[PDB]
Structure 1
Amino acid sequence: VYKPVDLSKVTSKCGSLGNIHHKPGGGQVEVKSEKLDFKDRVQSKIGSLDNITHVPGGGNKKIETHKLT
């Protein structure tokens, strides 16, 4: 028999949140290539990629997991 109980409070009382500046790759980017051999798969990423600005007014996280067998 399995009767877990959770009464969790997960909280923030943030007053003010602002003036967040993210400037990835603000300058010149250059690649020059001569007579290369590639004999299998290529992934190439060039420039400014996958950059995140994440500014949630609440970013609070609860994870829970339960098993029996």
Structure 2
Amino acid sequence: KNVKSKIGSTENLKHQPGGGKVQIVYKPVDLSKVTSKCGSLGNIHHKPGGGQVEVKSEKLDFKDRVQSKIGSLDNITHVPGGGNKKIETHKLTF
């Protein structure tokens, strides 16, 4: 069991604001094969090129305003537990 409650609250929540989440996996596999039997070869030049990976974030401008106004919280009964009995809240004004 999982219970979450909010009454009259204010939240500002951000995950990785500026640059975000970046995940890069670089795993090329090379299985080239040169074979010779009973013959003649010249020179071998094995010169394969590597990859380029680039991730960039240049000129970001992020601006937030959060405002909350409540006149009054009063006379609240909040029972997220179980098996309770005879819970009371009273208010009187003259």
Question: Which TM-score applies when normalising by structure 1?
Answer: 0.19
- Greater share of residues in strand: 1
Larger-gyration structure (1/2)? 2
Taking the aligned partners of 1:14 and 1:53, their CA distance within structure 2 comes to 93
Offset of residue 5 of structure 1: 0.5
Taking the aligned partners of 2:38 and 2:85, their CA distance within structure 1 comes to 16
Aligned residues, how many?
69
Taking a change above 3 Å as real, the CA distance of residues 56 and 43 of structure 1, as seen in their structure-2 partners, is closer
Which aligned segments of 4 or more residues in structure 1 are displaced greater than 2 angstroms? 15-69
Taking the aligned partners of 1:57 and 1:17, their CA distance within structure 2 comes to 83
Question: Which TM-score applies when normalising by structure 2?
Answer: 0.14
Give RMSD over aligned pairs.
33.6
Partner residue in 1 for 2:70: 46
Question: In structure 2, which of residues 49, 57, 60 is the aligned counterpart of residue 33 of structure 1?
Answer: 57
Q: Percent identity?
A: 100
Tell me: higher relative CO, structure 1 or 2? Use CA pairs within 8 A at least 6 residues apart: 1
Taking the aligned partners of 2:29 and 2:46, their CA distance within structure 1 comes to 42
Taking the aligned partners of 1:59 and 1:17, their CA distance within structure 2 comes to 87
Q: What stretches of structure 1 of length at least 5 have no aligned partner?
A: none
